[PDB]
RNA sequence: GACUAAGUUCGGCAUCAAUAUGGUGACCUCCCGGGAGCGGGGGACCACCAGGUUGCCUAAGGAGGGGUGAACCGGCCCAGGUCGGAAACGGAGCAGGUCAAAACUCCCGUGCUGAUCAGUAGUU
């Protein structure tokens, strides 16, 4: 229950800061699904698990492609990372930017 | 070609105003004036109307950068479009000592638009008070009204003592700043 | 009738820019704290505002007065509802209210500019 949230709005590049968005417009992406998120932060072997019906508060939107929360592990409970590659939440944004492109196109 | 600057001046701007001293009306009839003007008129010169328009644009201006030291008394933001004003009526001023200057106009008419110009000129300076500058402007007014009033009667003189004695309190301003 | 300037009346067009200080709204890019809504802080840029000096500024350019600000586009206060929350509370924001400060627009002033009326004068 102690783990960062992720909503798709802050990786979302058609979004200005103030709509949510956590990482610069040049890494972001286009529309970001939670599942696509989920899929990819999972993929590298981070434990994530996918909250399909929580809805971003700023968020808008009331239609299904932009619901959704990603709630990630960093820590194994006794203080340690889980992993090293991610100590921080916008370690973690700035992968799953980087990986959910690869998927569709 | 003939125009008597002073005498105009004075009987336009007591006949619409300036009575009361209401540098709206005045300058409204100054403007009002210059439609005529221009309507009845539309290379150097032809007539003397046009002696008259060049001055009655002098006058709007004179008489609004007036209206506007009444305003400015409050209104400080307004001191600085009098002074545009004022640089204005300058301007047409010197733009008519020009036209004056054609040796078509007599040169009684010459001394007119020199002694104008140089009341407007010691206006300005007086305004942004400087107060050499302006003392200069009102001597040399005050030595041209002077020579026009010698050459004719006591009478027809009246008038340029009239303005003389006018102008007179705002030549002794400037002295008492440069003592 | 011709010349002279007043009076009467309704239109068209048009309406500058730079500085110092503070302000508003946006948007971009960094840190920092957080399980969320979110909290702390560094820069960059843009728009507008107030009012303090001004000009290689006007034919004339007020630092006026209003109104709209909606079917989603301004800012603010936001019932409900809603999203986040165990909750406190908060986000986003509707109905309604509201504006020095998105944008739009009317009026006043100012400038040019058609025009009206009396057959009015002043003087023939
Ligand atoms: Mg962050
Ligand atoms: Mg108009
Ligand atoms: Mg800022
Ligand atoms: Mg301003």
């Known amino acids: ?105 | 070609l003939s125009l008597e600057i002073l005498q105009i001046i004075k009987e336009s701007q007591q006949q619409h105003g300036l009575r009361h001293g209401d540098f709206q009306r005045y300058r409204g009839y100054c403007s009002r004036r210059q439609r005529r003007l221009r309507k009845t008129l539309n290379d150097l010169l032809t007539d003397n109307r046009y002696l008259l328009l060049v001055l009655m644009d002098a006058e709007r201006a004179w008489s609004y950068a007036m209206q506007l030291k009444q305003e400015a008394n409050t209104e400080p933001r307004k001191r600085f479009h009098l002074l545009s004003r004022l640089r204005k009526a300058v301007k047409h001023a010197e733009e008519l000592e020009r036209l004056c200057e054609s040796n078509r106009v007599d040169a009684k008419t010459k001394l007119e638009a020199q002694a104008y110009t140089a009341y407007l000129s010691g206006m300005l300076r007086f305004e942004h008070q400087e107060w050499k500058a302006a003392i200069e402007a009102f001597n040399k007014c005050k030595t041209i009204y002077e020579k026009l009033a010698s050459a004719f009667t006591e009478e027809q003189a009246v008038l340029y003592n009239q303005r003389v004695e006018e102008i007179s309190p705002n030549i002794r301003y400037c002295a008492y700043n440069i003592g």
């Open chain 1, 1 to 105: 229950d102690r783990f960062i949230c992720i909503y798709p709005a802050y990786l979302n590049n058609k979004k200005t800061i103030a709509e949510g968005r956590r990482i610069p417009i040049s890494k972001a992406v286009e529309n970001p699904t939670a599942t696509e998120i989920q899929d990819v932060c999972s993929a590298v072997g981070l434990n994530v698990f996918l909250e399909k019906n929580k809805m971003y508060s700023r968020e808008w939107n009331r239609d299904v492609q932009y619901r959704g929360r990603v709630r990630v592990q960093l820590k194994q409970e006794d203080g340690s990372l889980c992993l090293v590659q991610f100590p921080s939440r916008k370690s973690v944004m700035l992968y799953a930017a980087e990986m959910i492109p690869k998927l569709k196109t």
